[PDB]
Coordinates of C-alpha atoms and ligand atoms in Angstrom, one line a residue:
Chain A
X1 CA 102.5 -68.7 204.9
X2 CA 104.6 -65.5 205.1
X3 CA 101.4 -63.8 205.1
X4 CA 100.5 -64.7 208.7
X5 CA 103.7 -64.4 209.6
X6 CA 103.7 -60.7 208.6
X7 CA 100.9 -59.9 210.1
X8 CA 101.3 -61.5 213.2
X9 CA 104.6 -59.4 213.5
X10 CA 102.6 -56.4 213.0
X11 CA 100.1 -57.2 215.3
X12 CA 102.8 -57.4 218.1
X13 CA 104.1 -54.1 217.0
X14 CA 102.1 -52.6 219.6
X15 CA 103.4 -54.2 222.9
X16 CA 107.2 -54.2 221.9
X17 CA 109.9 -51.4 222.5
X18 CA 112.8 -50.2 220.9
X19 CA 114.8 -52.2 224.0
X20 CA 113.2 -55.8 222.8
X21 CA 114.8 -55.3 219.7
X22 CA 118.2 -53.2 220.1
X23 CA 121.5 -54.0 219.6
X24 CA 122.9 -53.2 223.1
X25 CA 126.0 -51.0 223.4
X26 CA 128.6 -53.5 224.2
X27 CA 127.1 -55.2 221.3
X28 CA 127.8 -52.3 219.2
X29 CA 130.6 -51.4 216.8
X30 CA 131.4 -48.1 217.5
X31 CA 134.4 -45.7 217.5
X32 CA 136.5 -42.4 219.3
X33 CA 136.0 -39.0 218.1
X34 CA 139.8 -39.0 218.5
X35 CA 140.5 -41.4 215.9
X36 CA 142.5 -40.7 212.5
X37 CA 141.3 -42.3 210.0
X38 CA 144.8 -43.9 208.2
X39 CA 144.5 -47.0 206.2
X40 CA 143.9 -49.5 209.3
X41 CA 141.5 -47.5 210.7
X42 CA 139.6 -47.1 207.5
X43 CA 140.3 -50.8 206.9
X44 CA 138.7 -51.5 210.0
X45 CA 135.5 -49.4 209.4
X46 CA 134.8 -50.8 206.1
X47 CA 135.6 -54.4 207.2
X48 CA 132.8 -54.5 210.2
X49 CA 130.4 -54.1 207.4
X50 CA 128.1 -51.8 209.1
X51 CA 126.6 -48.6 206.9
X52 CA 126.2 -46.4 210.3
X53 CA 129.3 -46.3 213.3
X54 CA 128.4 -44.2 216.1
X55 CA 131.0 -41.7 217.3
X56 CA 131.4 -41.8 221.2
X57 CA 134.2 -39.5 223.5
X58 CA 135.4 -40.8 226.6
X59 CA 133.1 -43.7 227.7
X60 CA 131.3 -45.3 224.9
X61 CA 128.1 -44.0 226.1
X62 CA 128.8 -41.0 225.4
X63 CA 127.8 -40.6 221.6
X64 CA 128.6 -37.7 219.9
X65 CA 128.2 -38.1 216.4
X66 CA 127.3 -40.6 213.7
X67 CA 129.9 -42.0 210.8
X68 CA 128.7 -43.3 207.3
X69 CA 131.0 -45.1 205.4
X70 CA 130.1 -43.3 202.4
X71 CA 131.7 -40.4 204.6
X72 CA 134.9 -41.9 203.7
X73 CA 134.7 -41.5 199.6
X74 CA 136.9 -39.1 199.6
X75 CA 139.4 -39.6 202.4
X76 CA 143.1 -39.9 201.3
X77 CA 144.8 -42.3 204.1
X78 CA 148.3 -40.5 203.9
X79 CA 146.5 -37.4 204.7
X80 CA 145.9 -39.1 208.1
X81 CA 142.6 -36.9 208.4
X82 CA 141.6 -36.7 212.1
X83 CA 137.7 -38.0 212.2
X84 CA 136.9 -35.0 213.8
X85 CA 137.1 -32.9 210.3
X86 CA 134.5 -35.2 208.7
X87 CA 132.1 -35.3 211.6
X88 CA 132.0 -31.7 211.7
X89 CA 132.0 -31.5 207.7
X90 CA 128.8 -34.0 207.1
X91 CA 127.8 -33.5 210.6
X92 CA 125.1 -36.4 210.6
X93 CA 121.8 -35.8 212.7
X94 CA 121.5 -37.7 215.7
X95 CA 118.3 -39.1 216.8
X96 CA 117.6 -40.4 220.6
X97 CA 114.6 -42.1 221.2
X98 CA 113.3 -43.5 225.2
X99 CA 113.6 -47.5 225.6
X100 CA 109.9 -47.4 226.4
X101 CA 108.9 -46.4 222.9
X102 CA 106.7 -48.8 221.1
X103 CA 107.9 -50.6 218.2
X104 CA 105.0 -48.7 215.6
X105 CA 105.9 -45.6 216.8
X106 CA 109.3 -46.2 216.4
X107 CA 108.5 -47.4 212.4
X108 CA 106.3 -44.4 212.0
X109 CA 109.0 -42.0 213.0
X110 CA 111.4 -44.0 210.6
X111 CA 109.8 -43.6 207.8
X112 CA 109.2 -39.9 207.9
X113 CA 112.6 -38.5 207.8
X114 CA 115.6 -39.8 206.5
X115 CA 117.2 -41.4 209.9
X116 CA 117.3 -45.3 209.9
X117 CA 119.4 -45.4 213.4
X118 CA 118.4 -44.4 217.0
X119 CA 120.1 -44.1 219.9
X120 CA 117.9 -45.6 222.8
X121 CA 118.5 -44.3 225.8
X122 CA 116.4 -44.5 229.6
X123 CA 115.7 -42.0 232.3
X124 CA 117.7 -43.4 235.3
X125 CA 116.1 -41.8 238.6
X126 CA 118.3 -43.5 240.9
X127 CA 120.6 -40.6 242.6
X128 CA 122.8 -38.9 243.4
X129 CA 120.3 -35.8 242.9
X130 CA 119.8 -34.5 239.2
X131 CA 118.4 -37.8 237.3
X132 CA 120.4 -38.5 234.4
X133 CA 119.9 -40.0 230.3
X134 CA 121.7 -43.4 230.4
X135 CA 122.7 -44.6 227.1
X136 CA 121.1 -48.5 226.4
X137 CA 122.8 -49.1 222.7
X138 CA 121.4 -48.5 219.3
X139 CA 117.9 -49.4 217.0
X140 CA 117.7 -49.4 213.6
X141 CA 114.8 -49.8 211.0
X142 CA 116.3 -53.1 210.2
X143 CA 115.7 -54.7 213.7
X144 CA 112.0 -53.6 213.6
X145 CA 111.2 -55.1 209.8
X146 CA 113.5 -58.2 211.2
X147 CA 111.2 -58.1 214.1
X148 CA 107.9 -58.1 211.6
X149 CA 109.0 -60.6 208.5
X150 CA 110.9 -63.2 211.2
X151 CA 109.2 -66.2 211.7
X152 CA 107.5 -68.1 214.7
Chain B
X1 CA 97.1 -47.0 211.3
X2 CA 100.7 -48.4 210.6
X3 CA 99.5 -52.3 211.3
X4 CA 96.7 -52.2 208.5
X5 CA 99.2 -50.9 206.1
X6 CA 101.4 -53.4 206.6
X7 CA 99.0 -55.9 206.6
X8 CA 97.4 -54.6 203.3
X9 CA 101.2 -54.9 201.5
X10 CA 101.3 -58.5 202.8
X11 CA 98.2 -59.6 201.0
X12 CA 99.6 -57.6 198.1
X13 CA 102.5 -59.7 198.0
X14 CA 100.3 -62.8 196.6
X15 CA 99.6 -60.8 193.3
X16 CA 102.9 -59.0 192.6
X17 CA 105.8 -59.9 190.7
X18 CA 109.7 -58.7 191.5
X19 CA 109.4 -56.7 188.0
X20 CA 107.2 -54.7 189.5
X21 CA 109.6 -53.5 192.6
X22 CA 112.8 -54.4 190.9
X23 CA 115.7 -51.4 190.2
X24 CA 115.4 -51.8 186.4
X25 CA 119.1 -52.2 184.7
X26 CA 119.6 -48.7 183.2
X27 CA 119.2 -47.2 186.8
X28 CA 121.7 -49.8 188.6
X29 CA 124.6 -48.6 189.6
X30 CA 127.5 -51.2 188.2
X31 CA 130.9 -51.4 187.5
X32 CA 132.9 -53.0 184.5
X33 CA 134.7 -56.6 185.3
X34 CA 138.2 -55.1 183.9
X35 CA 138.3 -51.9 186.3
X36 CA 141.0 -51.2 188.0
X37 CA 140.9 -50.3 191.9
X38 CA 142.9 -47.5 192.3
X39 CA 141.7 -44.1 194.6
X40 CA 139.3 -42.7 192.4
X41 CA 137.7 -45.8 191.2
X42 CA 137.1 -46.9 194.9
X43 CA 136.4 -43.5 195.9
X44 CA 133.3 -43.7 193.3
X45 CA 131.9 -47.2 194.8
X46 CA 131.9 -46.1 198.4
X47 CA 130.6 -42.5 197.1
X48 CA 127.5 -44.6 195.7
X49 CA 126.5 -45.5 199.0
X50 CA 125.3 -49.2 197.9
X51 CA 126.2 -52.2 199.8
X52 CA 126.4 -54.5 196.7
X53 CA 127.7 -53.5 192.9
X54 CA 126.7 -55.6 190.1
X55 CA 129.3 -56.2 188.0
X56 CA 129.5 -56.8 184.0
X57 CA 131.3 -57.8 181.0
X58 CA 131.1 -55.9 177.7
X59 CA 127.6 -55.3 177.9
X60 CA 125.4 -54.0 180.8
X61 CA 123.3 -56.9 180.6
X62 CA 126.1 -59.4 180.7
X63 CA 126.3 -59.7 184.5
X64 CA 129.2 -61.6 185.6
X65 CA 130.0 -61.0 189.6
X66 CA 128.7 -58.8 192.7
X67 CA 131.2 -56.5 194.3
X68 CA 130.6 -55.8 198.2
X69 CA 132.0 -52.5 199.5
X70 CA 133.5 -54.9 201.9
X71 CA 135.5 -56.3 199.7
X72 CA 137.3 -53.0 199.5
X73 CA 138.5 -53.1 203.4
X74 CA 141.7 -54.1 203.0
X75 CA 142.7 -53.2 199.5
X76 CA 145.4 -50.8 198.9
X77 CA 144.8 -48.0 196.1
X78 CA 148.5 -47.7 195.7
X79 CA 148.7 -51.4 194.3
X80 CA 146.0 -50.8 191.9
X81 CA 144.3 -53.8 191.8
X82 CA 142.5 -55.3 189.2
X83 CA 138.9 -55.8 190.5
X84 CA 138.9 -59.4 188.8
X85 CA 141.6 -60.6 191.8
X86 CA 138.7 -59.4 193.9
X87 CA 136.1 -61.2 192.4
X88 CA 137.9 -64.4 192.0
X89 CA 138.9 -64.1 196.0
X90 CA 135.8 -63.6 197.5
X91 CA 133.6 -64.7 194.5
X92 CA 130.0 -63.6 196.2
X93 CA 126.8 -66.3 194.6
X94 CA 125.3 -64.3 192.3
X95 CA 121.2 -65.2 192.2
X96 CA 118.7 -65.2 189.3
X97 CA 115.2 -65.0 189.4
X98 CA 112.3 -64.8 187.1
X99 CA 110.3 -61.4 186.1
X100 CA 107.1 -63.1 187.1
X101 CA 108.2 -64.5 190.0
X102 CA 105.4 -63.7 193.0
X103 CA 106.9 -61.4 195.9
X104 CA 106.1 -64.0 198.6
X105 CA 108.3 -66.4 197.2
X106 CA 110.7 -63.7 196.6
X107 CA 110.8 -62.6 200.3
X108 CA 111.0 -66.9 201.2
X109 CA 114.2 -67.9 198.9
X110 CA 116.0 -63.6 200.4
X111 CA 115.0 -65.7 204.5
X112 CA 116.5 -68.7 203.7
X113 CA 120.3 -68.3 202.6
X114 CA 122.4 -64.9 202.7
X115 CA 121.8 -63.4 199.9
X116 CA 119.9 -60.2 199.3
X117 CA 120.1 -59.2 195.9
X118 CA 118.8 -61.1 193.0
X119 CA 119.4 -60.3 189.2
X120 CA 116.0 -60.3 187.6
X121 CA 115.9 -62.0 184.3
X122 CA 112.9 -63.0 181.9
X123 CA 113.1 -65.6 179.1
X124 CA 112.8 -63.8 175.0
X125 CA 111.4 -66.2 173.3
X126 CA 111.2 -63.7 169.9
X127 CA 114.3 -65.4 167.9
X128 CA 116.7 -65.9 166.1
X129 CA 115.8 -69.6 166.9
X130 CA 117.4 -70.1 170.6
X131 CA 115.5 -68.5 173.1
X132 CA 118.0 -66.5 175.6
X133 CA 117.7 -65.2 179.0
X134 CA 117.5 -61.6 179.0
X135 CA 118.4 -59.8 182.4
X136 CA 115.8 -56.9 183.1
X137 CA 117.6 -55.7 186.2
X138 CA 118.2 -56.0 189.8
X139 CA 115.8 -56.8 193.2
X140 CA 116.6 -57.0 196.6
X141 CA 115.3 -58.0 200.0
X142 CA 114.9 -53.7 201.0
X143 CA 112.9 -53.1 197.9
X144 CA 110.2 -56.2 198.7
X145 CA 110.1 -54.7 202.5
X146 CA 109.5 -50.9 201.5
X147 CA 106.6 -52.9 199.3
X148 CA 105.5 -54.1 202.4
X149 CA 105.1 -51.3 204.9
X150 CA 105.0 -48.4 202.0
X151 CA 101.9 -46.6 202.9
X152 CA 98.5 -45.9 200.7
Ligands
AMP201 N1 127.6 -50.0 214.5 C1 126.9 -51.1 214.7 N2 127.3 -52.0 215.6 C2 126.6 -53.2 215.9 N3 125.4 -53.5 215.2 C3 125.0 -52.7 214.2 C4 125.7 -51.4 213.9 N4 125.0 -50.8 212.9 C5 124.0 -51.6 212.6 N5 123.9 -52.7 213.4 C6 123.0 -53.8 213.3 O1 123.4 -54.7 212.3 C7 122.3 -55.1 211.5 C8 122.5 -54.6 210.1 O2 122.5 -53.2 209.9 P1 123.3 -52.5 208.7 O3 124.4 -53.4 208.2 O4 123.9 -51.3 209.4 O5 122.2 -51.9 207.8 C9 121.0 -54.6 212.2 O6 120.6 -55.5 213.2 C10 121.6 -53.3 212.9 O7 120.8 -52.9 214.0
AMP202 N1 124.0 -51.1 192.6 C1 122.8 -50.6 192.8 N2 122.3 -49.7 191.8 C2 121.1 -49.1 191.9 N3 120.2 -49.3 193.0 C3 120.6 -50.2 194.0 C4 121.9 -50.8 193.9 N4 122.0 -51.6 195.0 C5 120.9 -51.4 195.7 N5 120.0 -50.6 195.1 C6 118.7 -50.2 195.6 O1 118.9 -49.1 196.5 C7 118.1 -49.2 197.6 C8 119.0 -49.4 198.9 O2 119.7 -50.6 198.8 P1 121.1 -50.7 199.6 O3 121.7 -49.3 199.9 O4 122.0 -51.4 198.7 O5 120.9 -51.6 200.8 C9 117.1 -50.4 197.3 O6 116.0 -49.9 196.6 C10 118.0 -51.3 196.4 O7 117.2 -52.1 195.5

């Protein structure tokens, strides 16, 4: 049935992290905060198809931001608007969340809130001193309900 | 917990139809077959923030195509396309399904194949002699899932 299936995936809710089920960052379409967004660029956003593009600067592990494509509504390509104006305009919340983190919790903080996309990042102890946040890629709501309805 | 909740809304998927979940047609966002896309008209789709627009003939319940926002990448408001040439190009499926058809099945028939969205339909059989399909709305694979793990 679907029925076990279901439930099965929410049995196994409990063991899994966020980094089971990520997309990892070279995986992910992403783009510069230094970007304008003309017609190609804009083409290029709406064509990948994804409703959330995380801004990075420099390396793409840095992430600065978050784009919605409803964030581009109102853009005029001939204005050539740097996406810098409408990161700072909408200024979407971003949400980090540790590659240990259990798949439940992960759903629970989900659902309260409006944030459907997390950033999963690790502690990485290995110095070089001060130990750092290292960036692992992206988990959305999507991958955990894929995780629960997917069959086995 | 989250698991029994989950659970719960899996065995409640048995008894459920996709009227019960569906977006009913008077609070669908759609778009008429003879628009044109010009700035402001594709400015309002990507404003709506849905993935996939029904869209209709004459009346709201004639339902001929599904717009993707996708479909918008690479047009150019300038030309003012018609959004028919869009339709004929990419010409998504569109799927029907039955008022009392059970969730389950529902969430089997969104696994297999792409599509997510189904229009919902139920047969009137009040005549007027020929019985016609009358479509009640719109369901898709988001609003069977928040069925799922919606808690209670
Ligand atoms: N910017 C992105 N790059 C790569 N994968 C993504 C991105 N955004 C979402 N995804 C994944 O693509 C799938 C569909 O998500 P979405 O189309 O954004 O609702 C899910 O598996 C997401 O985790
Ligand atoms: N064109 C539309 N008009 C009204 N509601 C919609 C439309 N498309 C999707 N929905 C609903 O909005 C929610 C989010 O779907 P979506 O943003 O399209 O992935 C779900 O409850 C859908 O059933």
């Amino acid at each position: 049935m679907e029925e076990l299936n279901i439930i099965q995936g929410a049995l196994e809710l409990r063991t899994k992290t966020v980094e089971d089920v990520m997309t990892p960052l070279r995986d992910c379409f992403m783009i510069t905060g230094e970007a304008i967004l003309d017609f190609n660029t804009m083409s290029e956003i709406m064509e990948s198809g994804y409703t959330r593009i995380p801004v990075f600067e420099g390396e793409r592990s840095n992430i600065v931001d978050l784009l919605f494509v409803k964030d581009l509504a109102f853009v005029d390509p001939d204005d050539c608007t740097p996406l810098k104006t409408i990161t700072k305009f909408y200024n979407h919340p971003l949400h980090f969340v540790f590659n240990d983190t259990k798949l439940d919790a992960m759903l629970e903080e989900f659902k309260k809130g409006k944030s459907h996309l997390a950033i999963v990042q690790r502690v990485n102890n290995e110095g070089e001193g001060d130990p750092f946040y290292e960036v692992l890629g992206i988990v959305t709501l999507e991958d955990v309900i894929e995780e629960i309805i997917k069959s086995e």
